[PDB]
C-alpha cells in the first residue's frame, strides 16, 4: 500500500525536485508528521522553510492531502504561505514561508507575556480562525507550537496537517485528532464536533501564555485526556495575576458545552482584545532580543 500511496501523491504535487534550486538544508525543528528545515534559494540567497514528511511514518497517511487542500484553496495573511509541494523519494516536501522569529512555544517557555502581547496573539489567531471556520476548515491542532512569528512580531497560523473540512453535507467530524493536553472535551468524548474545538484549544493556549504550560502537563497524555473529559474546565495556576478582562475572555473559550462556547466571530468583539498591541510589541519576546 505504500507504493500505491506514493503514486497518488505524485498526481497532486508539483513535478521535480527542489534540491535543484535549494542549498544548505538545516533542520530547525520537528513534529510527529516530520521535520522542518531552512534552506537557501541558490539564485537569490532568499531563505525558505521546507517540511519533510516520510510517507511510511504517518499515524494517518490520508491527512497528508490536507497540506495540498489548504495550499490550493485556503490562503490568508495570518496563515503561513505554502509555495510548492514535491514528492522526493518516500517523502512529501512542502516548501513554505520561513517564519524566522520562530514559534510561540519558545516564548511561553522562557518569558512572561503581558496582556497586551497575549491579546495581540489572540487577535491574530482569531482573525485567521474566523475566516477558516467560515469556509468549513477546522485546524484541530491549535497550540503554541503551531503559531509562528516573523522577525518584526507578526503572528501566523501554521501546521495544517491535522485539519478537516465540514459542510452542509458533512456538518461534524468524528476523528480523534490533536495534541492530548489541548484537545476539546467533546472531541475526547468522541461526540461529533465542529470548529468549536479550535476555540477550546485556543483557550488552552491562553493558559500556556499565562502559566507556561497547558493544564495537567505533568500527567501522562492518556490520563490528562480523562481529566479534561471528566472535570470542570481547567483553571489558570496564575489566576491571581490576570485581569478581570482576560479571565472573562478565557471563560468564553473554556466552556465545556460546545454550543455555549463563543465562536471566533463573536470573540473578535470581546473587550479583552482592545488591549492588543501591534506586532512591534511582540518583538522583544523573541530569543534573539531577550
Amino acid at each position: 500500500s505504500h507504493e500505491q500511496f506514493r503514486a497518488a501523491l505524485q498526481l497532486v504535487v508539483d513535478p521535480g525536485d527542489p534540491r535543484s534550486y535549494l542549498d544548505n538544508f538545516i533542520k530547525i525543528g520537528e513534529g510527529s508528521t516530520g521535520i522542518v528545515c531552512i534552506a537557501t534559494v541558490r539564485s537569490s540567497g532568499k531563505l525558505v522553510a521546507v517540511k519533510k514528511m516520510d510517507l511510511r511514518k504517518q499515524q494517518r497517511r490520508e491527512l497528508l492531502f490536507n497540506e495540498v487542500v489548504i495550499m490550493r484553496d485556503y490562503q490568508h495573511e495570518n496563515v503561513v504561505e505554502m509555495y510548492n509541494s514535491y514528492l522526493v523519494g518516500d517523502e512529501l516536501w512542502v516548501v513554505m514561508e520561513f517564519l524566522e522569529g520562530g514559534a510561540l512555544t519558545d516564548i511561553v517557555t522562557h518569558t512572561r507575556m503581558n496582556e497586551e502581547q497575549i491579546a495581540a496573539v489572540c487577535l491574530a489567531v482569531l482573525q485567521a480562525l474566523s475566516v477558516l471556520h467560515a469556509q468549513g476548515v477546522i485546524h484541530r491542532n491549535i497550540k503554541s507550537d503551531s503559531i509562528l512569528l516573523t522577525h518584526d512580531g507578526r503572528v501566523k497560523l501554521s501546521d495544517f496537517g491535522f485539519c478537516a473540512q465540514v459542510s452542509k453535507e458533512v456538518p461534524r467530524r468524528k476523528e480523534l485528532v490533536g495534541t492530548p493536553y489541548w484537545m476539546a472535551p467533546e472531541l475526547i468524548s468522541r461526540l461529533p464536533y465542529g470548529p468549536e474545538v479550535d476555540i477550546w484549544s485556543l483557550g488552552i493556549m491562553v493558559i500556556e501564555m499565562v502559566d507556561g504550560e497547558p493544564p495537567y502537563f505533568n500527567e501522562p497524555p492518556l490520563k490528562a485526556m480523562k481529566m479534561i473529559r471528566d472535570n470542570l474546565p481547567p483553571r489558570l495556576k496564575n489566576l491571581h495575576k490576570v485581569s478581570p478582562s482576560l479571565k472573562g475572555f478565557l471563560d468564553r473559550l473554556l466552556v465545556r458545552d460546545p454550543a455555549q462556547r463563543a465562536t471566533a466571530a463573536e470573540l473578535l468583539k470581546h473587550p479583552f482584545l482592545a488591549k492588543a498591541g501591534p506586532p512591534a510589541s511582540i518583538v522583544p519576546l523573541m530569543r534573539q532580543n531577550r
Binding site: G31, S32, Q59, K143, G178, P180
Partner: peptide, 6 residues
Amino acid sequence: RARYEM
C-alpha cells in the same frame, strides 16, 4: 509532558 500529536 509530550507535545506530540495523536
